[PDB]
Design a protein around this ligand. Sequence first.
Ligand SMILES: CCCCCCCCCCCCCCCCCC(=O)OC[C@H](COP(=O)([O-])OCC(O)COP(=O)([O-])OC[C@@H](COC(=O)CCCCCCCCCCCCCCCCC)OC(=O)CCCCCCCCCCCCCCCCC)OC(=O)CCCCCCCCCCCCCCCCC
Ligand SMILES: CCCCCCCCCCCCCCCCC[C@@H](O)O[C@H](CO[C@H](O)CCCCCCCCCCCCCCC)COP(=O)(O)OCC[N+](C)(C)C
Ligand SMILES: CCCCCCCCCCCCCCCCC[C@@H](O)O[C@H](CO[C@H](O)CCCCCCCCCCCCCCC)COP(=O)(O)OCC[N+](C)(C)C
Ligand SMILES: CCCCCCCC/C=C\CCCCCCCC(=O)O[C@H](COC(=O)CCCCCCC/C=C/CCCCCCCC)COP(=O)(O)OCCN
Ligand SMILES: Nc1ncnc2c1ncn2[C@@H]1O[C@H](COP(=O)(O)OP(=O)(O)O)[C@@H](O)[C@H]1O
Lengths: 347, 459, 98, 55, 104, 122, 320, 56, 49
Amino acid sequence: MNPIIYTTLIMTVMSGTMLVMISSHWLLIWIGFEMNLLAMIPVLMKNFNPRATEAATKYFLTQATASMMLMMAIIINLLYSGQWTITKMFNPVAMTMMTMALAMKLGLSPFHFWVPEVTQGISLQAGLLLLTWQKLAPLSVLCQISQSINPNLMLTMAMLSILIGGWGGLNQTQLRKIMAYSSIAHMGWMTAVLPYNTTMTILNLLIYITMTLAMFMLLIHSSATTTLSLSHTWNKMPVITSLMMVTLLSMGGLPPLSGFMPKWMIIQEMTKNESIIMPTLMAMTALLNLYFYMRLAYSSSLTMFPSTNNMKMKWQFEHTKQMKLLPTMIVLSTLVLPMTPALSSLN
Amino acid sequence: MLKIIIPTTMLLPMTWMSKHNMIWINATVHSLLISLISLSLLNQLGENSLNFSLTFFSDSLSAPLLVLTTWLLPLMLMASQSHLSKETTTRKKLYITMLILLQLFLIMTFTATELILFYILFEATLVPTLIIITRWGNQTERLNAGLYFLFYTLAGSLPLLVALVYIQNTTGSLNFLIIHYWSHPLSNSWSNIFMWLACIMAFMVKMPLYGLHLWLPKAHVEAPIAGSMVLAAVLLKLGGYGMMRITTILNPLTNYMAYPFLMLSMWGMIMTSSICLRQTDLKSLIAYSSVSHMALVIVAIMIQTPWSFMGATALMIAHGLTSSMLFCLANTNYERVHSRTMILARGLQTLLPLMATWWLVASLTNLALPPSINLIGELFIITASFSWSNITIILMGMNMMITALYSLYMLITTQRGKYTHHINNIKPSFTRENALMALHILPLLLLTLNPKMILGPLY
Amino acid sequence: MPLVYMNIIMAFAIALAGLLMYRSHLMSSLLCLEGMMLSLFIMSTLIILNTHFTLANMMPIILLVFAACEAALGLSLLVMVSNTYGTDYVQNLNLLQC
Amino acid sequence: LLDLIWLETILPKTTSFIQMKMSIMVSNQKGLIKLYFLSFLITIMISMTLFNYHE
Amino acid sequence: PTIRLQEDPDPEDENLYEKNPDSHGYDKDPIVDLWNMRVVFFFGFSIVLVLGSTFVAYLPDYRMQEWARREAERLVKYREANGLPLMESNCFDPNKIQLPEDED
Amino acid sequence: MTMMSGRPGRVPLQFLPNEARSLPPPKLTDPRLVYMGFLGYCSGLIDNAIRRRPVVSAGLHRQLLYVTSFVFFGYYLLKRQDYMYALRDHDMFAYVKSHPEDFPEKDKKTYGEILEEFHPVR
Amino acid sequence: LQYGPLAFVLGERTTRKLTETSKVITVDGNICSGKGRLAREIAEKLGLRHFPEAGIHYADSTTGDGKPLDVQLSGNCSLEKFYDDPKSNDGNSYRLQSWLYASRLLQYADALEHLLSTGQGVVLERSIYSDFVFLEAMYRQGFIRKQCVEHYNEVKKVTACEYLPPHVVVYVDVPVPEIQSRIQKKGNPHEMKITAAYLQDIENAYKKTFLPEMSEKCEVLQYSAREAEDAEKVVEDIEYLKCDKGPWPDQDDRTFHRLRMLVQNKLEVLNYTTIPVYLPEITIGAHQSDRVFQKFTELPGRKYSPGYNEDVGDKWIWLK
Amino acid sequence: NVLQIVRDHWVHILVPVGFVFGCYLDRRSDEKLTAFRNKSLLFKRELRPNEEVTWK
Amino acid sequence: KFYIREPPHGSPDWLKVGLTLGTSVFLWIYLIKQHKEDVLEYKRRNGLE
Ligand SMILES: CCCCCCCCCCCCCCCCCC(=O)OC[C@H](COP(=O)([O-])OCC(O)COP(=O)([O-])OC[C@@H](COC(=O)CCCCCCCCCCCCCCCCC)OC(=O)CCCCCCCCCCCCCCCCC)OC(=O)CCCCCCCCCCCCCCCCC
Ligand SMILES: CCCCCCCCCCCCCCCCC[C@@H](O)O[C@H](CO[C@H](O)CCCCCCCCCCCCCCC)COP(=O)(O)OCC[N+](C)(C)C
Ligand SMILES: CCCCCCCCCCCCCCCCC[C@@H](O)O[C@H](CO[C@H](O)CCCCCCCCCCCCCCC)COP(=O)(O)OCC[N+](C)(C)C
Ligand SMILES: CCCCCCCC/C=C\CCCCCCCC(=O)O[C@H](COC(=O)CCCCCCC/C=C/CCCCCCCC)COP(=O)(O)OCCN
Ligand SMILES: Nc1ncnc2c1ncn2[C@@H]1O[C@H](COP(=O)(O)OP(=O)(O)O)[C@@H](O)[C@H]1O
């Protein structure tokens, strides 16, 4: 693929997201989703092989079904009230359709099956893009229509997302599938607090995006897509594996690391309403994500696995392409908790 | 109290800027100086606490714990440098960095005025300990031990956080002074019962409570020597300190609620003391002894009387010192013979006489020989329990017997008898090990000379 | 609503169920996708004509445009799939699991 | 009997067994779009019935 | 190869007394080891231990024990001389306490 | 639930309205700004470490730029956060003042008049 | 500026630099045949860059300073001990074969990078497409196991598919008795132990797999021993080849861009050499790996990046 | 000759400097809690002819 | 001693170093000026001086 064509496609994906984010008309939001999907499909197939083709096909089918349900919800809302503005969604059936369609777009359980498969079938760069940038638009729409949400449905889907993310990620040896299941669980966390405070949703999204970017950039830096491939990195770059371990600690939610900030705040917010049982269950379930992060850290950093002979040659060469934003992303993903009150700037 | 906090954060770059052959010297010297500085916190008042600022305060309950932590750091530095000789410079600096971060977290934990900051620091203490255990441990089970050390803690502490924030939505503050002054009774309802359990079970799992103690033998046996020292000396006392702090809001629900934990603690001290009688590993025996003593402390905090609180404070300090000394003593033999089996090396009094004297003093202090502060705390707790109910003297009494047995048993198995014939590499004791033992043991008797400094705020 | 509105919504539901239930061919599911788009066009046109929303009369046309894109996209993918297996069967898209 | 077997059986081993079984249940999917698109249909119908009809 | 991989043999432990018969067990460098011993002994026993015990022993009475004793002596003297009871069952004056109007 | 998005008089993408100029600016020695500079220094050190350069000595201009950028962003971040908290307090006080029926200041009772149940510890 | 997407967007295009003499040339032949002299002569006459055959220490000559490093920190294999004890129980034979394949892959990447950056032709002795014959000669003699051959095939399958085959393959044919006589006259005491079965296996591997399958990609120039000394005749034969049958003419500018990004960044080239397949011959335990890596990092110009080692005379570090 | 000695033993001032800085910061923190200085019912006192504050 | 060019030479890239230092000093000067103006403006609005 031409570099100019690739740049144009990335800009089109971004422009679709911003069109969703700046629009006041439902038709323009649907158009932004359409344009984003159309430009996103070739990015998944940038390196051509049967697995990438299958992943792109599954992604296209899922997103097309979700977009059709979105259009149906918009049309029903227009039928019961001639309103095109993105607002309190005057019809409950249309709101259920919208919630289900946006959940399918986000990968929320039980519309979650496509995320691990698509993430596994594509490269690490496309996985980074899919798991970071592709969450903004549906979450922005959900934040906009939060007042008319049915708390039961989204809370059910969020709890299911956390549970399924933990359980599914428990069984994975492939790094991309581990990332996909972590994404599902974090999606559940962000959607659990949406009916109560959108600022907490935005904060959680930002922290998750920073952590995911750092993780994926570290996985790109050391060309590892499996656990056994990552177990060789200590014999080539030990600092990378050390930073990887601290990043995994932060993603696990342990204090005083930055990954503790969102959950903490979310729990606090849910106790400002009554909502006592749900945060307790959510934390107890997030312990599973912590477990498989810890297992990865055991495999890559806290123990030394056997290596190969040809690794010696790799000692003589250096990394040519250097990611400029990796150190800042690592620092933000680890040492940011003392700046917690700055979240007031989000609202 | 930044005059103690800042010097540790300065210990960090001093370690990372030191020459390759001068890290241990600098770390030890400046840790000792920091301990000397922290000695000034013992000048406490009789009515209120030393309120340094809006964020930090010193009470009569936390000052001895802070002094114990700052004193323990140089001891761990001295103990660690023997088995890390072949390690590279960067990894040695990383190990020292982990120890310094742990000490900083503990120092900030023992003086936080708010309960949520206390929670954050008391949970931040997990990361360096887990890294130390799972990276610098010796055998393969260490990984499993780390997992047992982690989730056992978090499963107890995640509910507490919820309870904490809930309280701040009801009373409007988590500051310990405002909490104490504006205290209100707890009603007898299911919501209040579960609030009590959420507030209590984290500290229970930290002590640990009998039945919730399975993480401790694993973690304390698989960890390196400094990890074992800090785990047994200070990290167990976080649960007791937190429980003594949090019990101010749980009255009068505590009388009804405590019963199962009291029975668990008493029968569990009996059971763990009995377990110590049949143990083939030397480190596991010390771990289970720690469990027994902490069960006694749990009973003391739970019955909620002034004498019981003084006993709990004294016993916590005494147990910290004694357990650290015992772990170091065991590690000397392990470093000699590269095995933890207790019957492998026998008759060591013949080969190492002064080391046998150290063993004798440590075993004597473990069984609470008077007038050591071990016995002071134990006797105060026993008197409080007798006032609570005259039948407790049975169970406590049985403990006082079994303890002595296993303690002396340990000594008799290691020092007396005839030496193993085929073990021909028992080198003479170094100055470092003898100095470590002396620096463990002398403060104990010095504290006995002046006991009101470790009796807590109820004095 | 009249009977026409429920008939159109019923057609949309039938097409959605048809897409969600795969038999063997990808082309059949693509056809169900186009059926959903057609039903949405009809429903939106009826709602706009009934209420005399003049400026909204252009929205269905725009809808059709993006429909074409979706169709083209699907067909493109279909070609690649066939080139790998010689058939358009969805049973062959099983290299990736959960 | 108590420390090495039953205290282990109840708290940590039961938890590990349950989590492993649920992980095997959740992650054992053949990757066929037919099956979980049928699941999507079931989910949509259930959500339209249980939550949407009760407003 | 009947082997599973290439590994170094397990090395034997080095004895510090072999190269330095008076080793102190601190370091393999004799000068560094000697100075480690010196600093540990000086700053552990000479500085922290003895001077810290001396400092703690002479800590000024902020717990207010002698003050409480003198106050108790004054109160006991006054109450015994005036014939008042030494201690009263009420620590608060009942004149400042308003009990509820009705107990039925 | 959005609390402050619909607040009247809000300019969409201002990040610092003119009213915020009425508040005292954060001091240049604010410990939060010092922590932001520490974050910049840490980023510089990690940048040196990843590229296999002497961590403490490799690039002084790069480390200086890191620290300066972090401080520069943190100053305005702190300004906006302080403005938001001031707005919250102002709105709270105005609402309390304008709704006296909802916030009644009832009679204060001394502890000599309130009956508190006593629960003995025994 | 470093080559990349930006350099390709504006200006730089590879296809304009190819001036009918790009012509990657490899000259194959059995052991002790005069293929090196023929390669040097071909490069001299045609004005192409000659690449001496990649040995155990090829990677050392291209990084840091060109001086070779210790065998413990580089290679961890010996050809002399392969000749002495071909059936060693420490897996020296397959370790040497695997390291040699990796070195040949690195050399091919270097040659391709030079050709694509400058447009000047390159001549090579052996290539990744020719290495397998030695492996076959090891397998038919019982020197290595079948799992070693399987691992070699996996690495070759994932590596050699990303490059282009040579334009012209030159072969020098020497009879096995003549090879033995040349080895005898050479005087190296280790090559004297090469049995005729080994050389025969190499010759069958060549003449039955290498030439028949490389004749489909491009025409093969076979020369006997006597007609290999006349280098000018061989060169003039090379100048009259009609090369329109291989993948090379079907390479447009985007595939050249991809190949150029692949040949640089040698870590990407060597990625799949160290796949986590645990054969005892090539697997190294954690303790030895740690020791050898720590030893490597203490070399005079290896701890930091090439321009940041002040112990070899690097200045103004604190402004780089 | 002291250049080498300093470059070797300059890390021995970090901890005393940190201690002094901590004392200074503690004094600065004490400076911000004077809202009830010489105002409590128990210790309220008429100032001496020369002194300005009862405690710093 | 390098066998290759080692594009980073003994002397640093003076253009990039100068740009970095200039950006840092410009940012610091702008921050100081902004803080001064903010303090003056606040004092004016609240009428302290
Ligand atoms: C809370 C209070 C405040 C504390 C804040 C939190 C902590 C500090 C901030 C954290 C970030 C700071 C440093 C980041 C860059 C570190 C990267 C690195 O590799 O360092 C090596 C580097 C040495 O490398 P080199 O000199 O080029 O030559 C040796 C070779 O590189 C040889 O290198 P190699 O690559 O060949 O060796 C391989 C090695 C290399 O692997 C590593 O070095 C691991 C480094 C990972 C960095 C941490 C990750 C990101 C930050 C998160 C921190 C989490 C904190 C929260 C608590 C949880 C703990 C994890 O990997 C291993 O061996 C695997 C061992 C497995 C151990 C696993 C434990 C790792 C996590 C430990 C993190 C602890 C916090 C950082 C402590 C500082 C570390 C230098 O260390 C340094 O020299 C820099 C550190 C000190 C610089 C600051 C000093 C300033 C100047 C002194 C004057 C002070 C001014 C006072 C003001 C008043 C005037 C008087
Ligand atoms: C090797 C051979 C050994 C045998 C030979 C030994 C020779 C004799 C030496 C032994 C001395 C015998 C001791 C007998 C008692 C005399 C000392 C005693 O009188 O002093 C006490 C004082 O002792 C000190 O108070 C206790 C020492 C303080 C202990 C602190 C430990 C140092 C810090 C190190 C770190 C600690 C870590 C643990 C954290 C809790 C009295 O307390 P006090 O009634 O008031 O004094 C009243 C008058 N004042 C108040 C004006 C002073
Ligand atoms: C893990 C660390 C997370 C950090 C995240 C990245 C940090 C760097 C990103 C820099 C942000 C650039 C923004 C500055 C340009 C001006 C744009 C400005 O006009 O935006 C305004 C708003 O300003 C931004 O929102 C503030 C962004 C600040 C982000 C930092 C907060 C992170 C929480 C605490 C973590 C510690 C931070 C440490 C910093 C290094 C618009 O207000 P408004 O249009 O009405 O709100 C839209 C959303 N609504 C309506 C739904 C409410
Ligand atoms: C390794 C072992 C560690 C595991 C121990 C973890 C168990 C801890 C105990 C359970 C804590 C749950 C409580 C969470 C915080 C409660 C705070 C609170 O006060 O909320 C109550 C409500 O209380 C609750 O909602 C609690 C319900 C419990 C839900 C979660 C159940 C978790 C498991 C319960 C049984 C476990 C028993 C203890 C563990 C035994 C050891 C295995 C009041 O809320 P309102 O709705 O406003 O009521 C007044 C107006 N109506
Ligand atoms: N892939 C290989 N496997 C085993 N031996 C090899 C390999 N490549 C080269 N050699 C050894 O290199 C030696 C000489 O190489 P060769 O090219 O035939 O001679 P010359 O240097 O004169 O051209 C021979 O002993 C040959 O065995």
